[PDB]
Design an enzyme around this catalytic site. Structure first.
Site, PDB file in Angstrom:
ATOM      1  N   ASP A  10       0.832  -1.196   0.000  1.00 52.82           N
ATOM      2  CA  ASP A  10       0.000   0.000   0.000  1.00 52.82           C
ATOM      3  C   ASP A  10       0.868   1.248   0.000  1.00 52.82           C
ATOM      4  O   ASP A  10       1.920   1.297   0.652  1.00 52.82           O
ATOM      5  CB  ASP A  10      -0.962   0.050   1.187  1.00 52.82           C
ATOM      6  CG  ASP A  10      -1.993   1.158   1.042  1.00 52.82           C
ATOM      7  OD1 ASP A  10      -2.726   1.159   0.029  1.00 52.82           O
ATOM      8  OD2 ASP A  10      -2.060   2.039   1.925  1.00 52.82           O
ATOM      9  N   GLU A  12       0.830   5.686   0.143  1.00 47.74           N
ATOM     10  CA  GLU A  12       0.226   6.991   0.359  1.00 47.74           C
ATOM     11  C   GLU A  12       1.027   7.996  -0.452  1.00 47.74           C
ATOM     12  O   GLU A  12       2.255   8.064  -0.316  1.00 47.74           O
ATOM     13  CB  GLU A  12       0.222   7.382   1.840  1.00 47.74           C
ATOM     14  CG  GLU A  12      -0.295   6.304   2.776  1.00 47.74           C
ATOM     15  CD  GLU A  12      -1.801   6.143   2.711  1.00 47.74           C
ATOM     16  OE1 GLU A  12      -2.478   7.052   2.187  1.00 47.74           O
ATOM     17  OE2 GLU A  12      -2.308   5.106   3.187  1.00 47.74           O
ATOM     18  N   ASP A 110      -1.279   1.874  -7.213  1.00 48.90           N
ATOM     19  CA  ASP A 110       0.023   1.647  -6.596  1.00 48.90           C
ATOM     20  C   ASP A 110       1.014   1.104  -7.614  1.00 48.90           C
ATOM     21  O   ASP A 110       2.190   1.483  -7.607  1.00 48.90           O
ATOM     22  CB  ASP A 110      -0.109   0.683  -5.417  1.00 48.90           C
ATOM     23  CG  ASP A 110      -1.169   1.116  -4.425  1.00 48.90           C
ATOM     24  OD1 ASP A 110      -2.368   0.905  -4.706  1.00 48.90           O
ATOM     25  OD2 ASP A 110      -0.803   1.662  -3.363  1.00 48.90           O
ATOM     26  N   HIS A 153      -5.571   6.954   7.093  1.00 44.83           N
ATOM     27  CA  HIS A 153      -4.971   6.730   5.778  1.00 44.83           C
ATOM     28  C   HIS A 153      -3.458   6.557   5.926  1.00 44.83           C
ATOM     29  O   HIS A 153      -2.648   7.390   5.515  1.00 44.83           O
ATOM     30  CB  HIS A 153      -5.322   7.870   4.830  1.00 44.83           C
ATOM     31  CG  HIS A 153      -6.660   7.719   4.176  1.00 44.83           C
ATOM     32  ND1 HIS A 153      -6.874   6.876   3.106  1.00 44.83           N
ATOM     33  CD2 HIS A 153      -7.854   8.299   4.442  1.00 44.83           C
ATOM     34  CE1 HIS A 153      -8.142   6.946   2.740  1.00 44.83           C
ATOM     35  NE2 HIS A 153      -8.758   7.802   3.534  1.00 44.83           N
TER      36      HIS A 153
END
Ligand SMILES: [Mg+2]
Ligand SMILES: [Mg+2]
Lengths: 177, 144
Positions: A10, A12, A110, A153
């Site tokens: 994952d 950000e 991603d 998040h």
């Protein structure tokens, strides 16, 4: 065995614009084909310039401020190259080259950002992906009752919840053996 | 269900084959084909006109921003379309229905059934095969 391992990732970022935005946080896990977490990889916050952080969108500024991610990015000394070094070393020690897929929720985004900014890491991986969001949409359509009961998040929390979401789907909407 | 939800649960199936052939159609949530869209060649028309055709079709077929792209390994096609047909993609949801994801899950969790799964170069035939493959998966590895 190892060829059926999954590389869960994952990210950000400062936004969706692949031409302008950068990666500010990244987390990686390694599971077997049965979603058992075999290894916990690096969980890194990547340094990015102050101008890009001050120029983020309203959603990104609000959320990455309330979660303390923007302050951590201002605090970080980890460059993108060091992060790619750590992640590449981890996946090279955990997976055979070119055989394992990326996994996560809507992990194609991603994959776009990683193909642009961490190309060696992606070169270690297979081209196919395991998108939990595909199963999520299929569950919403075909099993709405089960979908209603399905399960910050930050990258590590998000990828852990992705693994759990896929596990719920397998337990509840896939054929029992 | 409530009025409009069945339309919000439609799928926009697309396929691109490299001169690029592009085909598109619409299914309901149960994979029944509802409408066939344009089947175009881009480099017999230009990219902008073809994007307009596909956008008008999906405007007639799906509500704005609610329905996902669908196909086999549709993430690569989405990578192409986000860059070269961005107005068409803005009408669609950001999530995708990747049949290859279900294929990998079937290979890992249901190998016996996987050996029976369905596997030309025209885009419409690729869409048909992808729909039939997803239907096989629903019939054979999903809860009855
Ligand atoms: Mg996520
Ligand atoms: Mg997140």
């Amino acid at each position: 065995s190892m060829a059926q391992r999954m590389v869960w990732v994952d990210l950000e970022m400062t936004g969706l614009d692949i031409e302008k935005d950068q990666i500010i946080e990244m987390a990686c896990l390694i599971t077997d084909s049965d979603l058992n977490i075999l290894a916990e990889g690096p969980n890194l916050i990547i340094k990015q310039p102050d101008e890009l952080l001050d120029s983020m969108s309203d959603w990104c500024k609000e959320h990455h401020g309330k979660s303390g991610l923007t302050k951590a990015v201002k605090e970080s000394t980890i460059t993108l190259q060091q992060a790619e070094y750590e992640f590449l070393s981890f996946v090279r020690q955990q997976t055979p080259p070119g055989l394992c897929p990326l996994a996560g929720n809507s992990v194609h985004e991603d994959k776009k950002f990683l193909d642009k900014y961490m190309p060696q890491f992606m070169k270690h991986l297979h081209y196919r992906i395991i998108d939990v969001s595909t199963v999520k949409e299929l569950c919403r359509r075909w099993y709405p009752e089960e979908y209603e009961f399905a399960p910050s998040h930050r990258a590590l929390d998000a990828i852990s919840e992705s693994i759990k979401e896929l596990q719920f789907y397998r337990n509840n909407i896939f054929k029992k053996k």
